[PDB]
C-alpha cells in the first residue's frame, strides 16, 4: 500500500490512458455523447463505465473523488461546488420528515444555520449534545435517530468527540456517523477508519490550500456516496463542482502533506508564545499540554492542527485593537489558506450581536481565531507581538 | 436604454474602475479581506458595500448577475453552479410545508424529480396544471398555493403558457410566479415583463452556448433574490459559481444575440424540412404555422427558438435507428451548444420501461428531440436526411 | 443528390473538425491537455517521437493535443496541409521569419507594417544581417522590378495596418512562382472567413489571433498555416529554438471557443462597419473616410476581388485637426478609447493625441500619419448605439 | 525584509488594492483602455505609470516579476511563454553579429540548439569553457566577449560554475554575466547575490512545481530587463506568458521552499542509496560527500537539489531495461514535477546518435537522469531497488 504522499500525487491515474499526459487533462465540458442510445440508455439506468452529463458525473471529478476517497480510507468519494454543498446535498438524502439529527455542541455558522432555518423547518427534529459525553448522547438516542453529525474538532472552542466511541453507539442503534473533517484533512484526521460513515469536507480550506476555489467533498460507503450523488447532488442541491476548479483542487492536495507539516509546526510556536503572555486569559490548541482534550486529540489527530482560538483580558476592546493592529495577519474569515488570516468573531461574523446574546453560543467575547498559514514564523511572530502591544 | 447586444457586452462594467482593463479581471479568490473589524463588522451586517466570502457574494459574479438582471428586465441577479442550483436554491426558500405549488403538466425530469422525491417528501404540496388553459388554473388555485412553476416552451413537447394571464391570476390570488426561461433566453422571451416574478436558467445551455460550464441564474426583484442568495444558496444548496465559469459564461452572453439569431434560422429551415419528410408523423416547432399555440407563439417569443421535437411512423424502433444513423449531430442530452444534438427520451433517459409508462408520462414512443446547433444548414440537411432514410 | 466528398461549410468545420467525442470519453468539448510534458510507455516509444516513425506526444513547446486540434482546425478553414499555435502574433511572424531567413537573404516588404513587425524587421532581426527593402505591393510591375536573386520571402498585409492598404496576392503568387521567393501574408484583419491568400497562392499565412479569432479579447495569440513542411520547419526552429513562443493549452481552448462563432462575429462586423462608413462618410465634420466597402475606398476593386466582405475596420480624418479630434474621442461614451481590434467591444484611437502624442505636426508625414486621424474597430454592440455616439462625440468635435 | 517564504507568497500584494481580494484576480484581458487621450499620449512614452496591451505590462504579469525578482534579490521581473522564451529573449537583446558569446561546457538541448542553430547562424561567434576553471574562462575573453552564458548546476553532470569568480572576470572585461538557475531556483541559489548580472528559469520546472504550465522569468537590473521586455520579448521573440499560467506560476510559487526541502532530502536518501549499488559505475549528485565539485557545490547552494544523474555499468543495454521496469517514475523529459520522472538519454533524447557521438557531445552510455519528486521515498526506493535488480 504505497504512502499519503504517494497516493495524493499518483492515485487513480495513470499517464498511459490518456495520451501519455503526465497531468490529468481538465474535462471541462458538460456533457459527453453516446455511441449509441442504447449505450446512452445504460447510463440514466446507471449499468456501466464512462459518461452523460457533468452534474452526476465528470472524469476530472471522478479522479478527484477516487483520490479523495484513498486519502480518507473510503469507499468512494463525492466533488460538490462548496463545503456547505457538501454537507446540505448529504443531509437532504439521508433525513426526511420525522427523522431526528444529532448535532455536536457547536457547528460552523452556516450549518447551524441550514440545520435550523433550513432542513429544520422542513419537520426534522434537531438535538444538540456533547459528543466527548458518551453517556449523555447513549441517553438521547431514540429509534427516529437517523444521523449524528459534529465537527472534530469543533468551530471555535476545538471542541473534541470521541469518534470511535460515537461509531460504536450509533452502530448499535442503526443511526448513520457523519463528520466534518475540514480542520484536519485526511492526513491529520481519518474519521472513517475510527468507524464514521461519511466524512465531509469544505475543501475550500486546506485542502486546495491557496484560497482560489470554492468546494467541496464526501467521502463514504459506496452506497452512502451512490444515494447522496443521485438524490441530494442530482436532485436537490445542484452544487456542481466546476472541472476547473476540480482540477485546481488536486493541484493542492499534491502539497496537502508538506503545507499541514508548515502549518502545525508554525501554529505550534504561535500557541507556545501566546501562552506566555500576560494579555491571554486561555488559548484552545490541541497541542498544548494544558489543552483540557489533550489525550483524545493525540488518539484521533496525528499532529494538533494550524487553528489556534484564544481569549484576551479586556474583552471586545482588546480584540478590535489587536485585529486592527494586525500588519501580516488578514482581518478575514476562511481558513487553511498560505496566507495567515485572522478573525474575532466578537467584532467581525457576529459583530450586530450584542454581548448578551453571544453567551447564549459557545462563542465568547474575547475570542480571536488565528488561521496560522506559510510564512516565516519570526516574521508571524513579530506581527502577534506588536499587535499585543497595540491591544493595551 | 442600450439595445440587448450592447448591454450583453458592456452592461455593469467600465474598465477605468479596473486599471482600464477592457474585459474584466477574474476574481479567482473564495475569501476577502477588510482593513479593519468595524468595516467587516458591516459586511456581516449587510450594511456596508464590499465582500467577504464568494459563496455569498462575489465580483466576477456580481457582474454577470447583473448583466444577467439586464438582459431580463429585472432589478437583481444571482449566479449559482447548475440549473438545478437555481431551481432548488429558489424553492427551497421560497416554499415551506403546507405550501401548495402549481406546476406545468410536464418538465424537465430532474425538476420531476426534484419536486416528486425532493422537496415534496418535505410536506410541500404538488400539483400538476394545463398553464394553457387558464379556466383550469384559476379553477386550481388556493390561498395555500405559494408558487406557480413553468417552463415555456415546455420540455420536451415544445408546449406552451400564456405568461401573462398565469400573472393575472396570479395577481388575483396572491401567489409567486416563476419561469424556467431556458429554452428561450432572455433574448426571445422575457417572462418579468409579462408579470413573472423569477426567472430561472440552466446557463450550462444557450447563455454558455459552448457546452464547456455548468451554470445557473435567477433573475426577479431585488428582495427576493436577497432572500435566495442568503438562504437558497449559503444555507441550503451550496451551488456556487467558480469565477472562472461566471467569466466564460460571461463570454458567452456577448454573442447570445448573434448566436439565438443563427439557431433560430437553421431550425426553422430544418423543421419546414422534417414536416415534408414521409418518415415524420408529427412536428413541434413554435415557427410553423402547423404548430397548435402558433398565435401565443408569435405574441410571446420574439423567434421560435432552436428546438425541435418531432415523431416517427415506426415508434421507438424508428428512433433508435435515426439516432444511431447520425453523423454530424451527436447523441445527447442537454441543448444549446454550437453542436447539433439530439436525443430520443424514449431509449435515452427514459428507457427500461413497456410504452405504458411513456405515455401517461407524455413522451411519445417515436419523440426525438433535437437541439439545431449552428453548422452549416445544408450539412445538418443531409445528415438528418439520410438518418431519415436509415430509420425505416 | 451529392456524396461524401463535399467539403463540410466553413461554419460546421469551424465548430467541428479534426475531433470526435468518442475518441476523448464522449466528452463534447475536448479535454484541455494543460500538461507541460507527456510521457512514455517503454523506453523506445520516447525515442521514436524525438527520430522519424512515431506518431505521438513528448513536450508542449512542440507539438500538445489541444494545440494540435486548434492547429489542424485553422488549417481547414485557411485550407491548409498544417498549423501551428504560438504565444502571440508576433510570436507567429518572428517565429516564421527566423527559420525561413538567414544573413545575405532578403526580404520585400509591403509599404507599411504593423509597428512591432517593422520594429522586428528594422530593429530586430534586420541588424543581424538579412536585408530589408519595401515595395507597394498594389504595383505588380514595381515588385518584379525589386526581385534579385537573394530576395528570400516577399512579406505583407492585405489589408495593411493602419491605412488598409492592399495587394493582389494572386498577382504577388506568380512573381514569387517565376522567381523563387516564399510569400508570407498577415492574414490577421480579413480572417480565413474573409479572406485566404493559401488559396490565392501564398506560402504562408500569419494571424495575430488575439484579434478576431478569439474575438473576445481576453487572450494573446498567433497561428500560422501553410505547407507541411514549412510548418514543421517552423515549429521545429523558430519556436522550438528560437522564440519559445510557446501558447497556453488553456488559451489555445478560448481561442477554439471563439472561433465557434468566428463566421457569425465577423458578418456582424461587417454589417456594422458598412453601416457606420456610410453614415461617416455623410456627415460634415469628416474629411475623408477609408474604408473597403464604399466605393471612393481607392483599392474598391481588388477588395472585392480578395475579400468576401469589407470587414470591421475604418478610418477617418476629421475637421478641425488635433484639437477637434482630442475632443472627438474624449466624448465617446460607449467606444473605448484603446489600441486592438477585433474585440466585441468597439474601440477607437485618435493616434494624434494618443499613440504619436509626443511627436510633432510636421513630423508625422516623414514618419507616416495624419492630423486629424481617427482609426474604429468596429465591435458587436447594436448598430445604433454605435451611431448616436459617434453622432454625439462629432457634436463635440464641433 | 521578511523571510522567503513570507515575500513568496505576500511581496508586492495588498488585498486592499483589489476590494480586498485575499487571492490577485486574473488579469486575462488583450487590452486596457484609457480615460482620455492624455492618458493615453504617455502609455507609449513612459512617464504615465499605467498599461496598454499585455505583450508589454500586464498587472497579473507584473505581480509575479515583482515577486520572482525580490526572491532572486535584483531590481526587475519579466515573465515569458517559456524558458526558451526567457533565454532567447535575454540573447537576442544583448547580442549582435561580430558578438562572441562564452558557454558553460555543457547546456540543456534546445538552448545548445538555440545558439548553434539559431542565432550562430547569424554572425554570433560561440565558445564554450570550462566555468570552474578561472584560468581558462580569463584566457578565453576576448574584446568581442559580451556574453557570458552557463548552467550550474548544469545537464548533466551537475557541473558547478564559479559564478563569484566568473563575474570578478567579467567585470575586467565589462561583460554581462546570464546565469540559468532553473534547477536550484532563488531558494537554493541566487546568482544575483554573487555577482551575475541576470537569472533565467524555465518556470516550467521547479517554480511551477506541478508539471501544467510552461513559463519562463528573467530577473535582474532594471535597465537590463527593461530592454529584454521592449526588444526581445516585444519585437523579437513575442513569448507572451498567459495571465492564466502566470496566476498558476504564483501559486506554485507559494509552496516553492515546502516542495524544494523534500525534493532535496528524497534526493539525498536516494542518492546514498544509489551511491552503494554493484549495478551503479558513478553517480553524480552534489551533496554526496565524494562529489568532485562538493565545497563549491555548498558556497553558492543552501541545499543539494532533487536532480540525480548516474551511470549503470551494463550501459546503453541496462539503462533501458531499468528505465522500462520503473512503475512509479515515469517515463519522460522535465524536471521539478511533483510526479518523479527519469530520463534515459541514450535510448531517448539522443538514440539518433551512434556510441562515440554521444561522448563528444558530453554524454554516457548509461547515463540516467532523476527527476526526485514529492512521493514518500519509501515508495521511490521500493521502485527504483526492482528497477536496478531487473537492469542486470
Ligand atoms: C460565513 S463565510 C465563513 C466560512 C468559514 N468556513 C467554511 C466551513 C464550511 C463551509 O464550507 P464552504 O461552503 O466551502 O464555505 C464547512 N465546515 C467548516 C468547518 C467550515 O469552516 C469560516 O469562517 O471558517
Ligand atoms: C438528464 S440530463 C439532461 C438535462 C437537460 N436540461 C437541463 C435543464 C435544467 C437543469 O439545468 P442544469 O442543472 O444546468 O443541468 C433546467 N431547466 C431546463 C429547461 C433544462 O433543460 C436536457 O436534456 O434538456
Ligand atoms: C501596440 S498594441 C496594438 C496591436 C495591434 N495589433 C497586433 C497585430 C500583430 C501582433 O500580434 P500580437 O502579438 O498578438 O499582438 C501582428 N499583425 C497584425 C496585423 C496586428 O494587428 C493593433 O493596434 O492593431
Ligand atoms: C526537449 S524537451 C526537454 C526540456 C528540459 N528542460 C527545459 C529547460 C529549459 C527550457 O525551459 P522550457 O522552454 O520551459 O522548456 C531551460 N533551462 C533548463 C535547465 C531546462 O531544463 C529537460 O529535459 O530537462
Not at 460538490?80 to 446540505?88: D, F, K, N, P, Y
Not at 457523519?178 to 475510527?194: A, G, I, K, S
Not at 462563542?363 to 516574521?379: P, W
Request: aromatic share 8%.
Amino acid at each position: 500500500l504505497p504512502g499519503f504522499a504517494t497516493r495524493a500525487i499518483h492515485h487513480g491515474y495513470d499517464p498511459q490512458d490518456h495520451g501519455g499526459a503526465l497531468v490529468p487533462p481538465v474535462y471541462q465540458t458538460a456533457t459527453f455523447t453516446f455511441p449509441t442510445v442504447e449505450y446512452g440508455a445504460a447510463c440514466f439506468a446507471g449499468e456501466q463505465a464512462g459518461h452523460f452529463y457533468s452534474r452526476i458525473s465528470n472524469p476530472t471529478l471522478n479522479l478527484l473523488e477516487a483520490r479523495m476517497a484513498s486519502l480518507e480510507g473510503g469507499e468512494a468519494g463525492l466533488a460538490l461546488a462548496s463545503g456547505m454543498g457538501a454537507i446540505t446535498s448529504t443531509l437532504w438524502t439521508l433525513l426526511r420528515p420525522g427523522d431526528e439529527v444529532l448535532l455536536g455542541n457547536t457547528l460552523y455558522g452556516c450549518t447551524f444555520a441550514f440545520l435550523h432555518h433550513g432542513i429544520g423547518e422542513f419537520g426534522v427534529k434537531l438535538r444538540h449534545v456533547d459528543m466527548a459525553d458518551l453517556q449523555a448522547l447513549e441517553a438521547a438516542m431514540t429509534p427516529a435517530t437517523r444521523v449524528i453529525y459534529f465537527e472534530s474538532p469543533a468551530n471555535p472552542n476545538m471542541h473534541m468527540a470521541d469518534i470511535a466511541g460515537v461509531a460504536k453507539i450509533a452502530r448499535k442503534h442503526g443511526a448513520t456517523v457523519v463528520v466534518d473533517n475540514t480542520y484536519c484533512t485526511p492526513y491529520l484526521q481519518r474519521p472513517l477508519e475510527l468507524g464514521a460513515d461519511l466524512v465531509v469536507h469544505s475543501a475550500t480550506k486546506y485542502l486546495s490550500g491557496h484560497g482560489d476555489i470554492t468546494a467541496g467533498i464526501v467521502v463514504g460507503s459506496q452506497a452512502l456516496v451512490d444515494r447522496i450523488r443521485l438524490q441530494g447532488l442530482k436532485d436537490m442541491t445542484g452544487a456542481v463542482l466546476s472541472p476547473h476548479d476540480a482540477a485546481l483542487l488536486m493541484r493542492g492536495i499534491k502539497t496537502l502533506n508538506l503545507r499541514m507539516d508548515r502549518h502545525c509546526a508554525n501554529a505550534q510556536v504561535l500557541a507556545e508564545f501566546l501562552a506566555r503572555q500576560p494579555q491571554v486569559e486561555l488559548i484552545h490548541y490541541p497541542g498544548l499540554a494544558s489543552f483540557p482534550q489533550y489525550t483524545l486529540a493525540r488518539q484521533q489527530m496525528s499532529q494538533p492542527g494550524g487553528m489556534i482560538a484564544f481569549e484576551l483580558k479586556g474583552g471586545i476592546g482588546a480584540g478590535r485593537r489587536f485585529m486592527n493592529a494586525l500588519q501580516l495577519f488578514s482581518r478575514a474569515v476562511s481558513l487553511g489558506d498560505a496566507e495567515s488570516l485572522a478573525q474575532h468573531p466578537a467584532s467581525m461574523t457576529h459583530s450586530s450581536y450584542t454581548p448578551e446574546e453571544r453567551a447564549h453560543y459557545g462563542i465568547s467575547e474575547g475570542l480571536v481565531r488565528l488561521s496560522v498559514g506559510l510564512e516565516d514564523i519570526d516574521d508571524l511572530l513579530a506581527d502577534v507581538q506588536q499587535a499585543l502591544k497595540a491591544s493595551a
